[PDB]
Write a protein that holds these residues in place. Structure first.
Motif, PDB file in Angstrom:
ATOM      1  N   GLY A 104       0.756  -1.308   0.073  1.00  0.00           N
ATOM      2  CA  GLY A 104       0.195  -0.183   0.053  1.00  0.00           C
ATOM      3  C   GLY A 104       0.669   1.289   0.022  1.00  0.00           C
ATOM      4  N   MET A 105       1.920   0.929  -0.301  1.00  0.00           N
ATOM      5  CA  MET A 105       3.051   2.267  -0.095  1.00  0.00           C
ATOM      6  C   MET A 105       3.428   2.905  -1.614  1.00  0.00           C
ATOM      7  SD  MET A 105       6.002   0.875   1.997  1.00  0.00           S
ATOM      8  CE  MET A 105       5.712  -0.440   3.138  1.00  0.00           C
ATOM      9  N   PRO A 106       3.242   4.106  -1.768  1.00  0.00           N
ATOM     10  CA  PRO A 106       3.786   4.682  -2.912  1.00  0.00           C
ATOM     11  C   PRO A 106       5.142   4.688  -3.125  1.00  0.00           C
ATOM     12  CG  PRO A 106       2.719   6.383  -1.693  1.00  0.00           C
ATOM     13  CD  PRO A 106       2.422   5.143  -1.132  1.00  0.00           C
ATOM     14  N   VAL A 107       5.862   4.733  -4.186  1.00  0.00           N
ATOM     15  CA  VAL A 107       7.442   4.820  -4.389  1.00  0.00           C
ATOM     16  C   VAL A 107       7.676   6.087  -4.879  1.00  0.00           C
ATOM     17  CG1 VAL A 107       9.413   3.728  -5.402  1.00  0.00           C
ATOM     18  CG2 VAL A 107       7.526   2.257  -4.625  1.00  0.00           C
ATOM     19  N   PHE A 108       8.776   6.679  -4.251  1.00  0.00           N
ATOM     20  CA  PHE A 108       9.112   8.261  -4.826  1.00  0.00           C
ATOM     21  C   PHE A 108      10.561   7.963  -5.396  1.00  0.00           C
ATOM     22  CE2 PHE A 108       6.055   9.262  -1.603  1.00  0.00           C
ATOM     23  CZ  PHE A 108       5.222  10.286  -2.330  1.00  0.00           C
ATOM     24  N   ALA A 109      10.927   7.990  -6.578  1.00  0.00           N
ATOM     25  CA  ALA A 109      11.816   7.485  -7.172  1.00  0.00           C
ATOM     26  C   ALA A 109      12.934   8.516  -8.007  1.00  0.00           C
ATOM     27  CB  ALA A 109      11.209   6.386  -8.280  1.00  0.00           C
TER      28      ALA A 109
ATOM     29  N   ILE B  33      11.221  23.189  -9.892  1.00  0.00           N
ATOM     30  CA  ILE B  33      10.941  21.963  -9.744  1.00  0.00           C
ATOM     31  C   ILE B  33       9.977  21.712 -10.748  1.00  0.00           C
ATOM     32  CG2 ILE B  33      10.411  19.968  -8.407  1.00  0.00           C
ATOM     33  CD1 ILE B  33      11.831  21.033  -6.291  1.00  0.00           C
ATOM     34  N   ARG B  34       9.981  20.427 -11.376  1.00  0.00           N
ATOM     35  CA  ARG B  34       9.039  20.046 -12.227  1.00  0.00           C
ATOM     36  C   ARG B  34       8.950  18.408 -12.016  1.00  0.00           C
ATOM     37  NH1 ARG B  34       7.741  22.588 -17.181  1.00  0.00           N
ATOM     38  NH2 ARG B  34       5.680  21.500 -17.519  1.00  0.00           N
ATOM     39  N   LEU B  35       7.523  18.043 -11.895  1.00  0.00           N
ATOM     40  CA  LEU B  35       7.044  16.694 -11.599  1.00  0.00           C
ATOM     41  C   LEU B  35       7.111  15.898 -12.794  1.00  0.00           C
ATOM     42  CD1 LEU B  35       4.838  17.827  -8.290  1.00  0.00           C
ATOM     43  CD2 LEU B  35       7.243  17.090  -8.207  1.00  0.00           C
ATOM     44  N   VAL B  36       7.381  14.757 -12.706  1.00  0.00           N
ATOM     45  CA  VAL B  36       7.014  13.451 -13.676  1.00  0.00           C
ATOM     46  C   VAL B  36       6.282  12.548 -12.895  1.00  0.00           C
ATOM     47  CG1 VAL B  36       7.713  12.146 -15.476  1.00  0.00           C
ATOM     48  CG2 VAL B  36       9.349  14.184 -14.818  1.00  0.00           C
ATOM     49  N   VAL B  37       5.082  12.266 -13.332  1.00  0.00           N
ATOM     50  CA  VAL B  37       4.188  11.404 -12.522  1.00  0.00           C
ATOM     51  C   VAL B  37       3.806  10.236 -13.474  1.00  0.00           C
ATOM     52  CG1 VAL B  37       1.711  11.421 -11.383  1.00  0.00           C
ATOM     53  CG2 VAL B  37       3.474  13.325 -11.169  1.00  0.00           C
ATOM     54  N   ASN B  38       3.605   8.946 -12.901  1.00  0.00           N
ATOM     55  CA  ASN B  38       3.193   7.690 -13.596  1.00  0.00           C
ATOM     56  C   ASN B  38       1.512   7.956 -13.375  1.00  0.00           C
ATOM     57  OD1 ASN B  38       1.605   5.145 -13.999  1.00  0.00           O
ATOM     58  ND2 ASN B  38       3.765   4.185 -13.949  1.00  0.00           N
ATOM     59  N   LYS B  39       0.718   8.411 -14.416  1.00  0.00           N
ATOM     60  CA  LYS B  39      -0.470   8.765 -14.373  1.00  0.00           C
ATOM     61  C   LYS B  39      -1.430   7.603 -13.735  1.00  0.00           C
ATOM     62  CE  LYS B  39      -4.656  11.100 -14.594  1.00  0.00           C
ATOM     63  NZ  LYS B  39      -5.624  10.131 -14.112  1.00  0.00           N
ATOM     64  N   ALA B  40      -1.233   6.536 -14.193  1.00  0.00           N
ATOM     65  CA  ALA B  40      -2.102   5.374 -13.612  1.00  0.00           C
ATOM     66  C   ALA B  40      -1.836   5.212 -12.227  1.00  0.00           C
ATOM     67  CB  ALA B  40      -1.682   4.141 -14.686  1.00  0.00           C
ATOM     68  N   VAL B  41      -0.573   4.804 -11.961  1.00  0.00           N
ATOM     69  CA  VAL B  41      -0.259   4.341 -10.301  1.00  0.00           C
ATOM     70  C   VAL B  41      -0.510   5.639  -9.686  1.00  0.00           C
ATOM     71  CG1 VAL B  41       1.407   3.802  -8.670  1.00  0.00           C
ATOM     72  CG2 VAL B  41       1.660   2.952 -11.335  1.00  0.00           C
ATOM     73  N   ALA B  42      -0.307   7.039  -9.764  1.00  0.00           N
ATOM     74  CA  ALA B  42      -0.658   8.135  -8.921  1.00  0.00           C
ATOM     75  C   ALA B  42      -2.270   8.192  -8.627  1.00  0.00           C
ATOM     76  CB  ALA B  42       0.176   9.427  -9.398  1.00  0.00           C
ATOM     77  N   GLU B  43      -2.974   8.121  -9.851  1.00  0.00           N
ATOM     78  CA  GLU B  43      -4.433   8.216  -9.503  1.00  0.00           C
ATOM     79  C   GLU B  43      -4.772   7.248  -8.422  1.00  0.00           C
ATOM     80  OE1 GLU B  43      -8.481   7.994 -11.129  1.00  0.00           O
ATOM     81  OE2 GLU B  43      -7.195   8.419 -12.917  1.00  0.00           O
ATOM     82  N   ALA B  44      -4.451   5.957  -8.642  1.00  0.00           N
ATOM     83  CA  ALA B  44      -4.835   4.850  -7.935  1.00  0.00           C
ATOM     84  C   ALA B  44      -4.295   5.176  -6.425  1.00  0.00           C
ATOM     85  CB  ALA B  44      -4.311   3.260  -8.386  1.00  0.00           C
ATOM     86  N   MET B  45      -2.754   5.608  -6.397  1.00  0.00           N
ATOM     87  CA  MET B  45      -2.429   5.947  -4.965  1.00  0.00           C
ATOM     88  C   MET B  45      -2.902   7.115  -4.504  1.00  0.00           C
ATOM     89  SD  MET B  45      -0.375   3.313  -3.081  1.00  0.00           S
ATOM     90  CE  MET B  45       0.234   1.637  -4.066  1.00  0.00           C
ATOM     91  N   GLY B  46      -3.615   7.928  -4.818  1.00  0.00           N
ATOM     92  CA  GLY B  46      -4.240   9.090  -4.159  1.00  0.00           C
ATOM     93  C   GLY B  46      -3.276  10.290  -4.076  1.00  0.00           C
ATOM     94  N   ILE B  47      -2.168  10.113  -5.037  1.00  0.00           N
ATOM     95  CA  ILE B  47      -1.295  11.238  -5.038  1.00  0.00           C
ATOM     96  C   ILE B  47      -1.913  12.608  -5.438  1.00  0.00           C
ATOM     97  CG2 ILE B  47       0.809  12.126  -6.252  1.00  0.00           C
ATOM     98  CD1 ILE B  47       1.424   9.917  -4.306  1.00  0.00           C
ATOM     99  N   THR B  48      -1.655  13.720  -4.688  1.00  0.00           N
ATOM    100  CA  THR B  48      -2.114  14.974  -5.014  1.00  0.00           C
ATOM    101  C   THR B  48      -1.121  16.007  -5.290  1.00  0.00           C
ATOM    102  OG1 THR B  48      -2.068  15.544  -2.633  1.00  0.00           O
ATOM    103  CG2 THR B  48      -4.099  14.553  -3.479  1.00  0.00           C
ATOM    104  N   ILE B  49      -1.302  16.662  -6.434  1.00  0.00           N
ATOM    105  CA  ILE B  49      -0.241  17.614  -6.958  1.00  0.00           C
ATOM    106  C   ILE B  49      -0.488  19.115  -6.249  1.00  0.00           C
ATOM    107  CG2 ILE B  49       0.792  18.839  -8.879  1.00  0.00           C
ATOM    108  CD1 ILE B  49       0.898  15.608  -8.808  1.00  0.00           C
ATOM    109  N   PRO B  50       0.510  19.500  -5.324  1.00  0.00           N
ATOM    110  CA  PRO B  50       0.495  20.944  -4.702  1.00  0.00           C
ATOM    111  C   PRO B  50       0.057  21.925  -5.852  1.00  0.00           C
ATOM    112  CG  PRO B  50       2.585  20.029  -4.312  1.00  0.00           C
ATOM    113  CD  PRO B  50       1.860  19.157  -5.357  1.00  0.00           C
TER     114      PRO B  50
END
Length: 156
Positions: free
Chosen positions: A103-108, A129-146
Protein backbone atom coordinates in the motif's frame (compact mmCIF):
# COMPACT_ATOMS: atom_id res chain seq x y z
CA UNK A 1 19.88 18.71 -8.42
CA UNK A 2 16.69 18.43 -6.26
CA UNK A 3 18.09 18.22 -2.76
CA UNK A 4 16.85 15.66 -0.17
CA UNK A 5 15.14 18.29 1.97
CA UNK A 6 13.36 19.80 -1.10
CA UNK A 7 12.25 16.29 -1.99
CA UNK A 8 10.81 15.58 1.41
CA UNK A 9 8.92 18.88 1.40
CA UNK A 10 7.45 17.82 -1.96
CA UNK A 11 6.60 14.39 -0.62
CA UNK A 12 4.76 16.05 2.29
CA UNK A 13 2.36 17.68 -0.21
CA UNK A 14 2.14 14.77 -2.66
CA UNK A 15 0.99 12.28 0.02
CA UNK A 16 -0.55 14.57 2.61
CA UNK A 17 -0.79 13.07 6.05
CA UNK A 18 2.29 10.86 5.65
CA UNK A 19 4.06 10.55 9.03
CA UNK A 20 6.76 7.90 8.39
CA UNK A 21 8.83 7.19 5.26
CA UNK A 22 11.38 4.49 4.47
CA UNK A 23 14.59 5.08 2.54
CA UNK A 24 16.51 2.24 0.89
CA UNK A 25 20.11 3.41 0.69
CA UNK A 26 22.91 1.67 -1.25
CA UNK A 27 25.95 1.36 0.99
CA UNK A 28 28.09 1.80 -2.13
CA UNK A 29 26.54 5.10 -3.21
CA UNK A 30 28.53 8.33 -3.05
CA UNK A 31 27.87 11.09 -0.48
CA UNK A 32 26.58 9.11 2.50
CA UNK A 33 28.08 11.63 4.94
CA UNK A 34 26.17 14.46 3.28
CA UNK A 35 22.88 12.73 2.40
CA UNK A 36 22.28 10.69 5.55
CA UNK A 37 22.47 13.57 8.12
CA UNK A 38 20.44 15.71 5.67
CA UNK A 39 17.67 13.11 5.83
CA UNK A 40 17.48 13.42 9.60
CA UNK A 41 17.38 17.19 9.36
CA UNK A 42 14.70 16.97 6.64
CA UNK A 43 12.73 14.71 8.97
CA UNK A 44 12.76 17.23 11.84
CA UNK A 45 11.91 20.10 9.46
CA UNK A 46 8.97 18.40 7.69
CA UNK A 47 7.38 16.44 10.54
CA UNK A 48 7.87 13.14 8.66
CA UNK A 49 9.93 10.45 10.43
CA UNK A 50 12.57 9.07 8.04
CA UNK A 51 13.89 5.54 8.60
CA UNK A 52 16.95 4.53 6.56
CA UNK A 53 17.71 0.93 5.54
CA UNK A 54 21.16 0.44 4.07
CA UNK A 55 21.87 -2.37 1.60
CA UNK A 56 24.96 -3.55 -0.24
CA UNK A 57 23.71 -6.50 -2.28
CA UNK A 58 20.51 -7.91 -3.69
CA UNK A 59 20.20 -10.39 -0.80
CA UNK A 60 20.07 -7.53 1.66
CA UNK A 61 17.19 -5.82 -0.16
CA UNK A 62 14.33 -8.13 0.93
CA UNK A 63 15.21 -8.43 4.67
CA UNK A 64 15.88 -4.69 4.91
CA UNK A 65 12.54 -3.85 3.27
CA UNK A 66 10.64 -6.14 5.69
CA UNK A 67 12.24 -4.32 8.63
CA UNK A 68 11.01 -0.97 7.28
CA UNK A 69 7.51 -2.41 6.97
CA UNK A 70 7.11 -4.53 10.13
CA UNK A 71 9.47 -2.81 12.63
CA UNK A 72 8.66 0.78 11.52
CA UNK A 73 5.35 0.69 9.61
CA UNK A 74 6.51 3.19 6.98
CA UNK A 75 3.89 4.58 4.60
CA UNK A 76 6.02 5.20 1.51
CA UNK A 77 9.35 4.18 0.00
CA UNK A 78 11.82 6.84 -1.10
CA UNK A 79 14.83 6.01 -3.31
CA UNK A 80 17.36 8.80 -3.77
CA UNK A 81 19.82 7.53 -6.39
CA UNK A 82 20.32 4.58 -8.70
CA UNK A 83 24.02 4.55 -9.52
CA UNK A 84 24.59 0.93 -8.45
CA UNK A 85 22.41 -1.78 -6.90
CA UNK A 86 19.27 0.37 -7.11
CA UNK A 87 19.77 0.78 -10.84
CA UNK A 88 19.51 -3.04 -11.36
CA UNK A 89 16.22 -4.37 -12.76
CA UNK A 90 15.89 -7.08 -10.12
CA UNK A 91 16.25 -4.67 -7.18
CA UNK A 92 13.93 -2.16 -8.84
CA UNK A 93 11.23 -4.74 -9.56
CA UNK A 94 11.46 -6.19 -6.06
CA UNK A 95 11.11 -2.85 -4.31
CA UNK A 96 8.27 -1.51 -6.43
CA UNK A 97 6.28 -4.75 -6.14
CA UNK A 98 6.65 -5.13 -2.43
CA UNK A 99 5.98 -1.45 -1.78
CA UNK A 100 2.85 -1.48 -3.92
CA UNK A 101 1.60 -4.69 -2.30
CA UNK A 102 1.99 -3.02 1.10
CA UNK A 103 0.00 0.00 0.00
CA UNK A 104 3.02 2.33 -0.28
CA UNK A 105 3.81 4.76 -3.06
CA UNK A 106 7.39 4.82 -4.40
CA UNK A 107 9.17 8.15 -4.80
CA UNK A 108 11.91 7.41 -7.27
CA UNK A 109 15.05 8.96 -8.76
CA UNK A 110 14.40 8.60 -12.53
CA UNK A 111 11.77 7.87 -15.17
CA UNK A 112 13.04 4.27 -15.50
CA UNK A 113 11.33 3.57 -12.15
CA UNK A 114 8.16 5.23 -13.35
CA UNK A 115 8.14 3.02 -16.45
CA UNK A 116 8.11 0.08 -14.03
CA UNK A 117 5.45 1.23 -11.51
CA UNK A 118 6.85 3.99 -9.25
CA UNK A 119 4.58 7.04 -8.66
CA UNK A 120 6.58 10.28 -8.85
CA UNK A 121 9.97 11.65 -9.77
CA UNK A 122 11.24 15.19 -10.16
CA UNK A 123 13.64 17.36 -12.09
CA UNK A 124 14.90 20.93 -11.72
CA UNK A 125 14.19 23.22 -14.70
CA UNK A 126 15.15 26.89 -15.11
CA UNK A 127 11.71 27.63 -13.62
CA UNK A 128 12.36 25.38 -10.67
CA UNK A 129 11.07 21.91 -9.80
CA UNK A 130 9.10 19.94 -12.35
CA UNK A 131 7.20 16.76 -11.47
CA UNK A 132 7.02 13.62 -13.58
CA UNK A 133 4.10 11.39 -12.63
CA UNK A 134 3.02 7.83 -13.59
CA UNK A 135 -0.58 8.83 -14.16
CA UNK A 136 -2.07 5.38 -13.76
CA UNK A 137 -0.39 4.52 -10.45
CA UNK A 138 -0.60 8.03 -9.04
CA UNK A 139 -4.35 8.21 -9.51
CA UNK A 140 -4.77 4.83 -7.81
CA UNK A 141 -2.41 5.78 -4.99
CA UNK A 142 -4.22 9.05 -4.20
CA UNK A 143 -1.23 11.27 -5.01
CA UNK A 144 -2.13 14.97 -4.98
CA UNK A 145 -0.24 17.71 -6.85
CA UNK A 146 0.40 20.92 -4.85
CA UNK A 147 -1.25 23.92 -6.46
CA UNK A 148 2.08 25.60 -7.26
CA UNK A 149 3.06 22.61 -9.43
CA UNK A 150 -0.26 22.05 -11.22
CA UNK A 151 1.28 23.65 -14.34
CA UNK A 152 4.77 22.09 -13.86
CA UNK A 153 3.75 18.43 -13.99
CA UNK A 154 4.25 16.00 -16.90
CA UNK A 155 2.62 12.56 -17.13
CA UNK A 156 4.75 9.59 -18.28
Amino acid sequence: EVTPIQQLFLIKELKPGIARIGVIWDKNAANRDEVLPQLQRASAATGIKVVVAEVASLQEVAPQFRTLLRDHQVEALWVLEESGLLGQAAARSFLIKNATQAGMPVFAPSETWLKEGACVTWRKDAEGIRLVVNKAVAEAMGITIPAKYQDRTAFL
